[PDB]
Motif scaffolding. Structure first.
Motif, PDB file in Angstrom:
ATOM      1  N   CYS A  56       0.774  -1.200   0.000  1.00 38.10           N
ATOM      2  CA  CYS A  56       0.000   0.000   0.000  1.00 38.10           C
ATOM      3  C   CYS A  56       0.820   1.272   0.000  1.00 38.10           C
ATOM      4  O   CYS A  56       1.925   1.305   0.541  1.00 38.10           O
ATOM      5  N   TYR A  57       0.250   2.335  -0.504  1.00 38.19           N
ATOM      6  CA  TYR A  57       0.715   3.705  -0.512  1.00 38.19           C
ATOM      7  C   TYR A  57      -0.492   4.591  -0.259  1.00 38.19           C
ATOM      8  O   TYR A  57      -1.478   4.620  -0.891  1.00 38.19           O
ATOM      9  N   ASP A  59      -1.245   8.806   0.848  1.00 44.67           N
ATOM     10  CA  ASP A  59      -0.832  10.191   1.071  1.00 44.67           C
ATOM     11  C   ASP A  59      -1.230  10.649   2.477  1.00 44.67           C
ATOM     12  O   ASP A  59      -1.788   9.904   3.255  1.00 44.67           O
ATOM     13  N   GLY A  64      -4.997   6.506  -1.304  1.00 49.36           N
ATOM     14  CA  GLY A  64      -3.948   5.824  -2.006  1.00 49.36           C
ATOM     15  C   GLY A  64      -4.421   4.542  -2.715  1.00 49.36           C
ATOM     16  O   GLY A  64      -5.513   4.519  -3.271  1.00 49.36           O
ATOM     17  N   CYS A  66      -3.640  -0.058  -2.580  1.00 48.85           N
ATOM     18  CA  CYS A  66      -2.992  -1.269  -2.149  1.00 48.85           C
ATOM     19  C   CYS A  66      -3.124  -2.288  -3.296  1.00 48.85           C
ATOM     20  O   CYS A  66      -4.054  -2.346  -4.018  1.00 48.85           O
TER      21      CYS A  66
END
Length: 207
Positions: A56-57, A59, A64, A66
């Motif tokens: 995941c990423y 902000d 974001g 995953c």
């Protein structure tokens, strides 16, 4: 009810908790390897699920993506996650009892143990290497082992009509994890616990 969510995996996961139309507790949180996060789930929650999300990423506002289990791009899940997702499933305080299971019906991403921390019932576990052993046609290029419904969108795999049997794909999940649901009409592996039990969900319980 309390659910301690423990990441024993060697990789970070983003835990998620929802009842499909709302978050449970905060709905999601990062878990580095070894971390524990305890959530509170309201008594009477019906159709709750906890799952892990990988790679995941997000902000600073919590938005974001995953690769597995993404819930509409939110850190704080309000909705169920995108397959493949191993699922810890529960309905609490249903006529005096709680009901727990693990399901592979929406595929498998991370191994898990789902056990009570209080008396009166056994836990369930799906900790085999389903991703490693996954049939080629079910491997998700984004990561994990998809269920056959997700991949092929047939009445038979999705059990659309309430008419389905086991399949070569469901049998794979069932062979690797006998105590988890492998298709919609599987012989149930649901455990009855005392009403208002508390629980622990452990990702990667065995390695």
């Amino acid at each position: 009810a309390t659910f301690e969510i423990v990441n024993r995996c060697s990789y970070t996961v983003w835990a998620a908790a929802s009842k499909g139309d709302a978050a449970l507790d905060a709905g999601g949180r990062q878990l580095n390897s070894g971390e524990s996060w305890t959530i509170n789930v309201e008594p009477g929650t019906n159709g709750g699920k906890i799952w892990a999300r990988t790679d995941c990423y997000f902000d600073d506002s919590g938005s974001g993506i995953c690769k597995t289990g993404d819930c509409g791009g939110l850190l704080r899940c309000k909705r169920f996650g995108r397959p493949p997702t191993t699922l810890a499933e529960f309905s609490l305080n249903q006529y005096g009892k709680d009901y727990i299971d693990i399901s592979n019906i929406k595929g498998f991403n991370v191994p898990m143990d789902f056990s009570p921390t209080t008396r009166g019932c056994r836990g369930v576990r799906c900790a085999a290497d389903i991703v490693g052993q996954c049939p080629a046609k079910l491997k998700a290029p984004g990561g994990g082992c998809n269920d056959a419904c997700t991949v092929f969108q047939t009445s038979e795999y999705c059990c659309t009509t309430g008419k389905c049997g086991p399949t070569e794909y469901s049998r794979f999940f069932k062979r690797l994890c006998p105590d988890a649901f492998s298709y919609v009409l599987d012989k149930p592996t649901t455990v009855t616990c005392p009403g208002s039990s508390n629980y622990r969900v452990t990702f990667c319980p065995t390695a």
